[PDB]
Every structure is written in structure tokens, then in C-alpha cells.
Amino acid sequence: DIMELLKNVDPKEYEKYARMYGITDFRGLLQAFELLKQSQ
Length: 40
Fold this sequence. Notes:
Elements: H1 2-6, H2 14-21, H3 26-39
PDB class: structural protein
Keywords: titin, UN2A, structural protein
Assembly: monomeric
């Protein structure tokens, strides 16, 4: 669960997550952060 992991990651650290987990869809990560905001 990416979002669950992103709970421990800042919305400005989407690049860090991408580099660590090898994510090419950085926009999906940004959207995931927005989804977390909705769940918040």
C-alpha cells in the first residue's frame, strides 16, 4: 500500500519516495498525497 507508506512521507518528499522505491509515476504519488488529504 503506497499511500500507507506515504503517511510517513512529506508531500514535498514525493521525489525521495520515488527514488527509494523506484517510482516513475511521480504524479500518481502526488495524487496519492491528495487522496491522503481526503482521508484526513
